[PDB]
Design a protein around this ligand. Structure first.
Ligand SMILES: CC(=O)N[C@H]1[C@H]([C@H](O)[C@H](O)CO)O[C@](OP(=O)(O)OC[C@H]2O[C@@H](n3ccc(N)nc3=O)[C@H](O)[C@@H]2O)(C(=O)O)C[C@@H]1O
Lengths: 245, 241
């Protein structure tokens, strides 16, 4: 069971031009993700999927494996489908190029889940959040069953707080593990109405009846999206260097 | 493939004591549901499951069939489980005793769905509602996949309208069809967190991985829970004559 980690890293960003190349304690952000991806036990290779030559250069510059992909890709999953044809593996893990604080152990939890059940097509992560955080549309919530299979994903607060004290929210962490056959059949799947409404790509899989198991982990580090969170990451990353000295 | 219709009709109600016996244009509400239930092709028997003698005798008076059930049940579903032990069938349809405007056709759509797919455990109904109606916590929304299987049931507006013009809403109509084996195992299912939070009993089935297919029908008529709706239903059923 060969498994590879793919890291989509596109330069063009609205509120942060050249986001993967931003410096964090002396290294480009993309490098931090790559370095952490390398610490994940059970992974054969680690690739960075990109559509910008500057990003490709920066990755090769530190000895990382880069693979150019089309720029006309509407979704980040289509990008993984293109990489799938060239890079062979049984399990593909999609890490986000803008989360430098990813814990290698969480990705191993994901990978182990995929290996413990050969019939599981897709797997993802989630963690507990308060009711106040769950109210944010920018935050994606998820509800699971006893087998931890996802029932639905939404920007709306679910479950609804009818009996407020009984509600427990789970924030969806955008890291996925896909079986090879799911990616082979992906481009044939049509866009669902909930997907287009919520603007959540993962609902395309649920429309087709593809099961997505969601594993719970502790609260994840703050992902870099705003310069306010960027400084917190820089200081939180630097605080980590001096603690492990 | 034997199918029977069960109509839960408890005497009590916080806003309308003795609700099933309330007169709607000449007949008690329960009689309207029972008569319409008898018009559903494919059903072998129709029973009113009640907890009060005054309701039982009222049903027997007009010719219907009634069965006494315990008074400590908190849900119409639990009451149905008690009936399943006395009345044998392969498929049980649970109609609400306070919806006298039920269309016999919609129940047949439900029954046909169950018969076309022997592997389907539970089936229910739904209809389209505007985005405005979807915002109400009292209106239970549902989202389905291509095979029309329910993804989730919620009082929250789902799907979330990030792209408003793309969102389409579905209101859940509380009529169910259960395969016998589902009822035999019901008492063993544990209450779920989403069930307790949303206060929606059907989420107990989804928590267990039991598939619920939702068939779409046209907008249904109002039920009788408040004395405001009772006057509305009397008005609607008077002009329907
Ligand atoms: C399908 C549905 O929506 N049912 C709801 C009904 C009515 O159909 C609606 O007004 C239509 O929009 O109204 C409510 O009825 P009840 O609270 O009485 O409960 C449903 C049903 O189950 C029986 N029952 C209830 C409680 C207990 N402990 N045991 C029972 O056996 C009742 O007799 C009734 O027939 C309402 O608003 O009050 C809610 C229903 O979900």
């Amino acid at each position: 069971s060969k498994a590879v980690i793919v890291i989509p890293a596109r330069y063009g960003s609205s509120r942060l031009p050249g986001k993967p190349l931003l410096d964090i304690v002396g290294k480009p952000m993309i490098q931090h993700v790559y370095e952490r991806a390398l610490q994940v036990a059970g992974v054969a290779e680690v690739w960075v999927a990109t559509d910008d030559p500057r990003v490709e250069q920066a990755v090769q510059a530190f000895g990382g494996k880069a693979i150019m992909t089309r720029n006309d890709h509407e979704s980040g999953t289509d990008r993984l489908v293109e990489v799938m044809h060239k890079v062979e593996a049984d399990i593909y893990i999609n890490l986000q190029g803008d989360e430098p604080m990813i814990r290698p152990r969480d990705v191993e939890t994901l990978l182990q889940g995929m290996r413990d059940d050969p019939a599981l097509p897709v797997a993802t992560l989630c963690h507990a959040i308060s009711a106040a955080e769950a109210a944010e549309p920018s935050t994606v919530k998820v509800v699971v069953n006893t087998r931890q299979d996802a029932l639905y994903f939404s920007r709306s607060p679910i479950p609804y707080p009818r009996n407020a004290e009984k509600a427990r929210y789970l924030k969806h962490v955008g890291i996925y593990a896909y079986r090879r056959d799911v990616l082979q059949n992906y481009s044939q799947l049509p866009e669902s109405m909930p997907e287009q409404a919520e603007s959540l790509e993962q609902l395309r899989l649920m429309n087709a009846g593809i099961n997505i198991r969601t594993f719970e982990v502790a609260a994840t580090g703050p992902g870099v999206d705003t310069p306010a969170c960027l400084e917190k990451v820089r200081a939180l990353m630097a605080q980590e260097l001096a603690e492990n000295a």
